[PDB]
Amino acid sequence: SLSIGRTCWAIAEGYIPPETVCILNAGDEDAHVEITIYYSDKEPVGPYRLTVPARRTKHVRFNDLNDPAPIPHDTDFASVIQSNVPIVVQHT
Amino acid sequence: SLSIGRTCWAIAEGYIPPYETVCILNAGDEDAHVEITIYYSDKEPVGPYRLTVPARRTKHVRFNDLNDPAPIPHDTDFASVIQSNVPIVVQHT
Amino acid sequence: SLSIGRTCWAIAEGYIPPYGETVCILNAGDEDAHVEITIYYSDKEPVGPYRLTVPARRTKHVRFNDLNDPAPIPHDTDFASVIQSNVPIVVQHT
Amino acid sequence: SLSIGRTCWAIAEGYIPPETVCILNAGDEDAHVEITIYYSDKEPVGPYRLTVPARRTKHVRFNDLNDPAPIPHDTDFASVIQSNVPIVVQHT
Numbered sequence: 001s002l003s004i005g006r007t008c009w010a011i012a013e014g015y016i017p018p019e020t021v022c023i024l025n026a027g028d029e030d031a032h033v034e035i036t037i038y039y040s041d042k043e044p045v046g047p048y049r050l051t052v053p054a055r056r057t058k059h060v061r062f063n064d065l066n067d068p069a070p071i072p073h074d075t076d077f078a079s080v081i082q083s084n085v086p087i088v089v090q091h092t
Numbered sequence: 093s094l095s096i097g098r099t100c101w102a103i104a105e106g107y108i109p110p111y112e113t114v115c116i117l118n119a120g121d122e123d124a125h126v127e128i129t130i131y132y133s134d135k136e137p138v139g140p141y142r143l144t145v146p147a148r149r150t151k152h153v154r155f156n157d158l159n160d161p162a163p164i165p166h167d168t169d170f171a172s173v174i175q176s177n178v179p180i181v182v183q184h185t
Numbered sequence: 186s187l188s189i190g191r192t193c194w195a196i197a198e199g200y201i202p203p204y205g206e207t208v209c210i211l212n213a214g215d216e217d218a219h220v221e222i223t224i225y226y227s228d229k230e231p232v233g234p235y236r237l238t239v240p241a242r243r244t245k246h247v248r249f250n251d252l253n254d255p256a257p258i259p260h261d262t263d264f265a266s267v268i269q270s271n272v273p274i275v276v277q278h279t
Numbered sequence: 280s281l282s283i284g285r286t287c288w289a290i291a292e293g294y295i296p297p298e299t300v301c302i303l304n305a306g307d308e309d310a311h312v313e314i315t316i317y318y319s320d321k322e323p324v325g326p327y328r329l330t331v332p333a334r335r336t337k338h339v340r341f342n343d344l345n346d347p348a349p350i351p352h353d354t355d356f357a358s359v360i361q362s363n364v365p366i367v368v369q370h371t
Contacts, residue, residue, distance in 0.1 A: 003101045004173060010189050012209040012277035023103040024131055026172040036231060038211055038244045056169035057131045059098065077171070078211040078244035078275070080189065090104035096289050096359060115291040115358040117317055150291060150317045150357035181357070183291035195283050197301040197336065197369035225303055225336045265303040265336035265367070267283065 002026045005088035013091070014062060014077035021060045021081065024088040025052040031083045037071055038078040045069055052087060093121040095171040097181035104183070106130070106155060106170035114174065117143040117181040124176045130164055131171040138162055145180060187213045190275035199224070199264035201250050208247045208268065211275040212239040218270045224258055225265040239274060243269055281305045284367035292370070293356035295343060300339040300360065304331040304368040310362045316350055324348055327362040330368060
């Protein structure tokens with residue numbers, strides 16, 4: 001049983017033009033992910049919830065997160081990505 | 093024997109264009125028997141894809157040329173785990 | 186109750202081009218971060234500290250171009266920075 | 280005094296077109312750096328020696344390393360950078 005990655009990741013950049021996080025769950029249990037969006041000038045927003053099933057990768061467009069709320073375009077943001085089980089997160 | 097790197101790497105991105113590269117350094121004195129597993133968004137992982145990076149050598153691995161057990165589909169998002177018997181350094185470009 | 190990042194970061198690259206370079210800092214914690222930046226050069230002593238605050242639960246984009254007290258950073262010059270904080274922060278320079 | 284970085288760095292990519300390493304020495308002692316260059320089909324070459332003085336940065340063009348030997352253009356390579364004192368290394 002492959003355990004790789006960690007349960008907490010932070011990405012200090014973010015910008016939607018008027019973007020993409022890639023998550024690997026190589027493990028045997030589904031990952032319940034929560035993402036919190038941070039801003040320069042207002043309180044953070046979340047959790048945005050999503051599942052990356054066991055032995056799957058998922059591409060997350062920040063542009064498509066809209067529950068609790070869409071992320072404003074042309075605004076600089078940062079995100080924290082938390083999970084119950086270790087995942088690998090990369091930002092292109 | 094210089095030992096640098098680790099035996100397990102994960103790359104969360106992967107895309108072959110429609111119709112990329114992993115750079116591996118083995119700076120040590122024993123050949124590295126590498127296994128790569130490829131993960132997908134909607135189906136079980138595929139692998140292991142096996143290759144050797146000899147002692148004191150680097151190797152460029154095009155995902156496009158990995159085809160045993162199977163070629164990786166184009167225009168498909170994927171992720172890889174790279175495992176080795178001996179520490180290696182892995183860069184994805 | 187979120188502590189993430191560290192109090193010390195080093196960026197070995199730095200270039201401001203002609204106009205007429207940026208660092209993103211996340212402070213996910215519950216205390217304001219008093220940051221200090223020291224700028225290093227290939228051929229002279231380092232310059233700093235440049236001071237700024239990243240408040241609790243905020244992110245801040247820092248344009249190196251705008252840093253100018255104690256001194257502006259020369260354009261067309263290769264530099265490096267060290268970013269120190271009283272509390273953990275996350276620093277990325279995409 | 281400020282100690283930051285480490286004494287060993289590996290860079291798995293390297294290409295000189297027919298290729299810059301930026302090194303920070305934030306410490307109070309000069310860093311005597313040795314670089315070894317690795318190839319896909321021959322023994323490694325080095326050490327290439329250089330100094331990054333106390334409290335200085337240095338840009339290192341792979342194209343300008345030529346003692347013991349120039350690095351061939353149009354060839355894939357990798358490097359190991361070792362130092363007596365910790366340094367911070369970034370590849371571009």
